[PDB]
Scaffold this motif. Structure first.
Motif, short mmCIF file in Angstrom:
data_model
loop_
_atom_site.label_atom_id
_atom_site.label_comp_id
_atom_site.label_asym_id
_atom_site.label_seq_id
_atom_site.Cartn_x
_atom_site.Cartn_y
_atom_site.Cartn_z
N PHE A 203 0.86 -1.17 0.00
CA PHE A 203 0.00 0.00 0.00
C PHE A 203 0.90 1.22 0.00
O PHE A 203 1.97 1.21 0.62
CB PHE A 203 -0.90 -0.01 1.23
CG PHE A 203 -2.16 0.80 1.10
CD1 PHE A 203 -2.13 2.17 1.16
CD2 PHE A 203 -3.38 0.17 0.97
CE1 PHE A 203 -3.28 2.91 1.05
CE2 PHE A 203 -4.53 0.91 0.87
CZ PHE A 203 -4.47 2.28 0.91
N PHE A 204 0.48 2.26 -0.73
CA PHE A 204 1.19 3.47 -1.14
C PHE A 204 2.23 3.21 -2.22
O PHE A 204 2.85 4.15 -2.69
CB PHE A 204 1.87 4.25 0.00
CG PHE A 204 0.92 4.79 1.00
CD1 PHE A 204 0.10 5.86 0.68
CD2 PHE A 204 0.84 4.25 2.26
CE1 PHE A 204 -0.77 6.36 1.60
CE2 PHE A 204 -0.03 4.75 3.18
CZ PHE A 204 -0.84 5.81 2.85
N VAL A 445 1.97 14.89 2.55
CA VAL A 445 2.34 13.72 3.33
C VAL A 445 2.31 12.47 2.47
O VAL A 445 3.20 11.62 2.57
CB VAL A 445 1.43 13.60 4.57
CG1 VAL A 445 1.56 12.26 5.24
CG2 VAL A 445 1.79 14.68 5.56
N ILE A 449 5.32 9.87 1.58
CA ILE A 449 5.24 8.43 1.85
C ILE A 449 5.59 7.63 0.60
O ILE A 449 6.26 6.60 0.69
CB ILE A 449 3.84 8.06 2.39
CG1 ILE A 449 3.63 8.64 3.78
CG2 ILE A 449 3.66 6.58 2.51
CD1 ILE A 449 2.25 8.42 4.30
N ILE A 450 5.19 8.12 -0.57
CA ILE A 450 5.44 7.41 -1.83
C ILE A 450 6.93 7.31 -2.12
O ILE A 450 7.45 6.22 -2.40
CB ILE A 450 4.69 8.10 -2.98
CG1 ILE A 450 3.19 7.85 -2.87
CG2 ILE A 450 5.18 7.61 -4.32
CD1 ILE A 450 2.39 8.65 -3.84
N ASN A 451 7.65 8.43 -2.02
CA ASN A 451 9.09 8.45 -2.29
C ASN A 451 9.65 9.70 -1.63
O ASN A 451 9.36 10.81 -2.10
CB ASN A 451 9.35 8.46 -3.78
CG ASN A 451 10.78 8.23 -4.11
OD1 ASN A 451 11.54 7.76 -3.28
ND2 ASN A 451 11.16 8.53 -5.33
N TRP A 452 10.47 9.55 -0.59
CA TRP A 452 10.81 10.72 0.21
C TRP A 452 11.85 11.61 -0.43
O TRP A 452 11.82 12.82 -0.22
CB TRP A 452 11.27 10.31 1.62
CG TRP A 452 12.62 9.64 1.72
CD1 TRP A 452 12.86 8.31 1.77
CD2 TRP A 452 13.90 10.28 1.85
NE1 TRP A 452 14.20 8.08 1.88
CE2 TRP A 452 14.86 9.27 1.93
CE3 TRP A 452 14.32 11.61 1.87
CZ2 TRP A 452 16.21 9.54 2.04
CZ3 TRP A 452 15.65 11.88 1.97
CH2 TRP A 452 16.58 10.85 2.05
N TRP B 452 13.13 10.19 7.91
CA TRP B 452 12.37 11.10 7.07
C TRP B 452 11.06 11.55 7.69
O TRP B 452 10.63 12.67 7.42
CB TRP B 452 12.11 10.50 5.68
CG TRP B 452 11.13 9.36 5.61
CD1 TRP B 452 11.42 8.04 5.61
CD2 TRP B 452 9.70 9.46 5.47
NE1 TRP B 452 10.27 7.30 5.52
CE2 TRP B 452 9.21 8.15 5.43
CE3 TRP B 452 8.80 10.52 5.40
CZ2 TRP B 452 7.86 7.88 5.31
CZ3 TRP B 452 7.47 10.25 5.30
CH2 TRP B 452 7.01 8.95 5.26
N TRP B 453 10.40 10.72 8.49
CA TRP B 453 9.10 11.14 9.00
C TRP B 453 9.23 12.07 10.20
O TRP B 453 8.41 12.98 10.36
CB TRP B 453 8.23 9.94 9.34
CG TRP B 453 8.86 8.90 10.17
CD1 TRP B 453 9.54 7.81 9.73
CD2 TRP B 453 8.84 8.81 11.60
NE1 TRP B 453 9.97 7.06 10.79
CE2 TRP B 453 9.55 7.66 11.95
CE3 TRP B 453 8.31 9.61 12.61
CZ2 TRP B 453 9.74 7.28 13.27
CZ3 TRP B 453 8.50 9.24 13.91
CH2 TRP B 453 9.21 8.08 14.24
N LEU B 456 9.99 15.30 8.50
CA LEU B 456 8.78 15.88 7.93
C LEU B 456 7.90 16.50 9.00
O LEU B 456 7.36 17.59 8.80
CB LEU B 456 8.01 14.82 7.15
CG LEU B 456 6.70 15.26 6.50
CD1 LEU B 456 6.97 16.31 5.46
CD2 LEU B 456 5.99 14.08 5.91
N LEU B 457 7.80 15.85 10.16
CA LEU B 457 7.07 16.41 11.29
C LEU B 457 7.70 17.71 11.77
O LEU B 457 6.99 18.70 11.98
CB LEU B 457 7.02 15.40 12.42
CG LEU B 457 5.63 14.99 12.88
CD1 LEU B 457 5.75 14.12 14.10
CD2 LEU B 457 4.78 16.20 13.17
N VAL B 460 7.19 20.53 9.14
CA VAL B 460 5.81 21.00 9.11
C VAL B 460 5.50 21.86 10.33
O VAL B 460 4.84 22.90 10.21
CB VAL B 460 4.86 19.79 8.98
CG1 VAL B 460 3.45 20.13 9.38
CG2 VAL B 460 4.86 19.30 7.56
#
Ligand code: POV
Ligand code: POV
Ligand code: POV
Ligand code: POV
Ligand code: POV
Ligand code: POV
Ligand code: POV
Ligand code: CL
Ligand code: CL
Ligand code: CL
Ligand code: CL
Ligand code: K
Ligand code: K
Lengths: 472, 472
Positions: A203-204, A445, A449-452, B452-453, B456-457, B460
């Motif tokens: 998924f994604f 976002v 998620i798809i490709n950073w 990366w997340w 991103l947090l 943002v």
């Protein structure tokens, strides 16, 4: 001047319906479930509905005469958002041309390999046929644009007859179409396909291949100078075409999942009921074992089913050869709509000297001032990506750039509503600034998620193009 | 008023030298090579040198009297950058307190387990000792701040004697210190340790654990109201302390790599030269096979060496018990410097009503108006992260937030130089706006490569705090 049907609704429905409708919907129900693919379609419809409300809020901000896609955005909002949206949208359509003609070339190559015609290997015939079909699509765009305004109702009545051919061929249980998958509408196949498999994807990763089937919604706003009344035509046809195409995607997903099994050997079996030792929902006399993969790190060594053959909608169809050759109509209409919309936006951007060096792609040769250097630049950017003769690696790139453009549109209308811009009074009934902010955050976002790293590159480029035009 | 040595240089050298100097440098030479660890130290020194030039450009922009860290940034640049830099820097120091006291607690727990003292399991004794040492560090910060200005030269002469103890104990070849690794300075061990192993980590996973050893450079700019002449003290001591501590890190890395083997069983061998069937550079009579891991998906089941024991600098040291208990000096000095600097910045931020609800953490109780609610909030944020009683998961969080703060500082001075701000004339000789832009892009890209997340947090959140203060 066109009405709202022939000028917005038919244009948006022809741009939205493209490669993934007939080629890669059944593969998406094969990888994910029925439930996860419906969640995917609902998420893409949520993103495009929020972006359609933002586009309608731009289009109802006065400014009737002398339209376009770049014109409305750059005149309601500033030049800082307008130039970056114009550049990212021009690049997105210029790279989407390659995705549509690679899907067309892949269909033609599989039709040739079903016969004996085979010149080179399968991935090199897509490079050859894809190159011929983009230098012929270039000739139509600079020499035959008059007939294209009449041919689009023809293309739409080919496409809708293809969809009805598939949907009425699903109900006809043919005993010869078994061994390619495709039993009738069955409860066992519906329960078996309700739940993910993800045989090499995630998924994604399946969402990034679906989401180009939801793009193309700015095909109605790309012609605001040719509409009768753009204040009532652009919010009507866009938000109706999004609903119609989303419901057709949900119907195709559920109908494909509830009548085709995931794997199938193309060998018929003489039995009508197999010995009770499998219970894999093919109680019709077919034993589709020895096609499920052994380890969880490989693809199946099968040839048909939802997971494998990519063309099972032509098997389900009542008359597959001619009517389900609406693949040609869908792919060529979307590729031709993206070949004339990327130099148009780029020529409108290169007439306002915002960015310094690109000013030579604005000199329109001829009588209608069609940008020929823009057409050749779009042809070069498309032909660079056609040589990656694989759809599943082109489609996440298009998904990245269209999520970037839609996030920029939603954030620009949120920022204009928040900042209290001087000429910003969007008289549209279903526009809210917090819905636009939610759509922009959701697109950013999902793009990460798809490709950073591609997302980080695109966001850094857009931030640089904003800070350049601010301090000029 | 302090001079530039006692007020900037000693403060920055005590804040920079912390956990990773004695605990986790040899592990970094164990995982990476000598070459990759020197590249890591040079990259962290490049980031902190660019940020030190940006901080010096802020500090030389007039504004002598009434200083601080938040004051100079928020008065040279705007409140939009100043409030976000203040919030991210306050949170970074508040979470760094936990990293320093978890390193201290881990050292005390390993010293207890070398004896027979063991109350609960090893990861629960760090939670117990780490909790006691942060409610005792809180009492010093609100009741004993007067002696701390005199104790710092004591702490520095403990720390430099620890460093000299290690560096002169490296040259003393002791036959008893073999079987824990540690032969003399040898060319075979230098050639063997020159090249990566990465036994469970990666490059940019080892960098994220090193980079907290380079932070702490704003300890001199955090006291500009207590300096004699901040225009000459802040660029001098900061850019000298960065050079001194970076050279000590490079010397420790090369000296550890060229005299300690990666794995070692703690059992002595009666031989003085092993049978010629291994050739693994331990020709001194030690066969350190059956400790290299079999598969490439597991850690070694050894107990000593560069990869394993985490305390091999106490083995190399000439007198291990007391002098290499400068770990306590380094960790407690850095934790105490970060416990008084996070409520200070946050109280200076909560006095300008920029952000709405946080205004209650500004009421300084007592005579010096020390922020007691800020001290208790910092104690709560630190105690939430001490319960993750593992240094290798705390340290990438601190690396993320300090890379965010340094990227914000570099981008703010670039944006003020580019925008031609009204009161921005940075008379510093080694400031260039493109070096600041390069440092900001480098910090943001490294922050995204690490995780990366979380990046991103953080981005943002910083974007939201900028757009909030712009349209207020
Ligand atoms: C946690 C928080 C972390 C935050 C970390 C930060 C995040 C990192 C963010 C990084 C953002 C980087 C911002 C860079 C700013 C650009 C410099 C500029 O503004 O123009 C300068 C260069 O002028 C030129 O001639 C160059 C023109 C193009 C430059 C920008 C495009 C490059 C990217 C597109 C590539 C091609 C794309 C096209 C194909 C798709 C102007 O020069 P000047 O001499 O100073 O002019 C004087 C006039 N003035 C004083 C009034 C100005
Ligand atoms: C991962 C690690 C990355 C590290 C590197 C990262 C690369 C970024 C590094 C960038 C540093 C390299 C650019 C410096 C060139 C300066 C030339 C010069 O000296 O003349 C002039 C500049 O006038 C110009 O012509 C500037 C031309 C550069 C503009 C593009 C900026 C980069 C955009 C980046 C877009 C994003 C990049 C990514 C997008 C794909 C001198 O300047 P000035 O105007 O006279 O002002 C000085 C005033 N002083 C007098 C204040 C007091
Ligand atoms: C490829 C390109 C892709 C692009 C995609 C981009 C997507 C990136 C997405 C980026 C998201 C950034 C946008 C969000 C910012 C909105 C700010 C806002 O609206 O506040 C407004 C109201 O709101 C409030 O009053 C809330 C109370 C303060 C909360 C601060 C904002 C949230 C910060 C959360 C941080 C938590 C931190 C926790 C630690 C403390 C301010 O109210 P006002 O003063 O009345 O303003 C009126 C202005 N006027 C007077 C001119 C009319
Ligand atoms: C991750 C993927 C999924 C993401 C989805 C979820 C992401 C979250 C995204 C969006 C969340 C949606 C927020 C809903 C706020 C509604 C309250 C309200 O009506 O306020 C209004 C009532 O005016 C007042 O009385 C003041 C009330 C406080 C202002 C609320 C601002 C909230 C800031 C939230 C900051 C978020 C920062 C985000 C940072 C992360 C004030 O505004 P207005 O009067 O309506 O102005 C209308 C002007 N107009 C008529 C021209 C249009
Ligand atoms: C905590 C807040 C929650 C937010 C929920 C919001 C809805 C989220 C819904 C659902 C949440 C996501 C569920 C699935 C996780 C993604 C799995 C995956 O595909 O791997 C991904 C990462 O690989 C990872 O490491 C994933 C680890 C989790 C990160 C995603 C959560 C952060 C959400 C955002 C936090 C910021 C919040 C911003 C402000 C709101 C892909 O790896 P890749 O290497 O990049 O791909 C290479 C592509 N290639 C093969 C073509 C080269
Ligand atoms: C020029 C400015 C333009 C700005 C935009 C530029 C675009 C960006 C440029 C470059 C980005 C290139 C990264 C692509 C990685 C491939 C996919 C992948 O594996 O993702 C992984 C990469 O995380 C890793 O650490 C994997 C091991 C190293 C792989 C290569 C790293 C970069 C190589 C050298 C590059 C040097 C770059 C320069 C610095 C000197 C993601 O996994 P994770 O994030 O580690 O998850 C951590 C989660 N955890 C904490 C729970 C464990
Ligand atoms: C991964 C993160 C996800 C989101 C990515 C973001 C996507 C970016 C895409 C689109 C978003 C656009 C960003 C700004 C939004 C506009 C609001 C604003 O700033 O108003 C200000 C304008 O702004 C400026 O004048 C200069 C912009 C500085 C922005 C610096 C952000 C630093 C945070 C770094 C963190 C981001 C790091 C991004 C990753 C590298 C003030 O308004 P004004 O008074 O009208 O100014 C007039 C000046 N003038 C007269 C010269 C015109
Ligand atoms: Cl499509
Ligand atoms: Cl579109
Ligand atoms: Cl440290
Ligand atoms: Cl610091
Ligand atoms: K489409
Ligand atoms: K430190």
């Amino acid at each position: 001047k066109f009405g709202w049907i022939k000028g917005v609704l038919v244009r948006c429905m022809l741009n939205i319906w493209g490669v993934m409708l007939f080629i890669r919907m059944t593969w998406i129900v094969g990888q994910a479930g029925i439930a996860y693919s419906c969640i995917i379609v609902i998420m893409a419809t949520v993103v495009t509905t929020i972006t359609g409300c933002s586009t309608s809020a731009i289009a109802t901000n006065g400014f009737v005469r002398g339209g376009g896609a770049y014109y409305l955005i750059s005149r309601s909002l500033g030049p800082e958002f307008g130039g970056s949206i114009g550049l990212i949208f021009a690049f997105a359509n210029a790279v989407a041309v390659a995705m549509y003609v690679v899907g067309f070339a892949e269909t033609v190559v599989e039709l040739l390999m079903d016969s004996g015609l085979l010149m080179i290997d399968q991935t090199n015939d897509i490079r050859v046929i894809g190159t011929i079909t983009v230098i012929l699509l270039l000739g139509i765009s600079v020499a035959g644009m008059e007939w294209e305004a009449k041919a689009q109702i023809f293309l739409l009545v080919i496409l809708i007859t293809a969809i009805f051919n598939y949907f009425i061929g699903s109900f006809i249980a043919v005993d010869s179409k078994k061994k390619f998958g495709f039993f009738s509408y069955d409860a066992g196949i519906l329960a078996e396909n309700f739940g993910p498999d993800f045989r090499g994807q995630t998924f994604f990763s399946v969402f990034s291949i679906f989401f180009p089937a939801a793009t193309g919604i700015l095909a109605g706003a790309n012609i605001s100078g040719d509409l009768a009344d753009p204040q009532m035509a652009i919010p009507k046809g866009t938000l109706l075409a999004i609903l119609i195409t989303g419901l057709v995607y949900v119907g195709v997903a559920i109908s494909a999942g509830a009548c085709i099994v995931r794997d199938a050997t193309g060998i018929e079996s003489n039995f009508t009921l197999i010995s009770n030792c499998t219970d894999a929902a093919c109680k019709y006399g077919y034993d589709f074992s020895s096609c499920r993969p052994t380890v969880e790190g490989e693809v199946s060594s099968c040839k048909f089913g939802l997971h494998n053959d990519f063309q099972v909608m032509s098997v389900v169809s009542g008359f597959s050869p001619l009517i389900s050759a609406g693949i040609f109509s869908a792919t060529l209409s979307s590729a031709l709509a993206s070949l004339v919309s990327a130099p148009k936006v780029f020529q409108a951007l290169c007439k306002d000297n915002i960015y310094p060096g690109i000013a030579i792609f604005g000199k329109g040769y001829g009588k209608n001032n069609e940008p020929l250097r823009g057409y050749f630049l779009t042809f070069g950017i498309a032909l660079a990506f056609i040589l990656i003769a694989e759809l599943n690696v082109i489609a996440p790139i298009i998904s990245n750039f269209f999520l970037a453009s839609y996030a920029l549109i939603n954030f620009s209308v949120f920022h204009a509503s928040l900042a209290n811009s001087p000429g910003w009074r969007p008289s549209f009934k279903y526009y809210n600034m917090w819905a636009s902010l939610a759509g922009a955050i959701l697109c950013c976002v999902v793009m990460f998620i798809i490709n950073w790293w591609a997302a980080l590159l695109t966001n850094v480029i857009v931030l640089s193009l904003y800070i350049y035009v601010s301090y000029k």
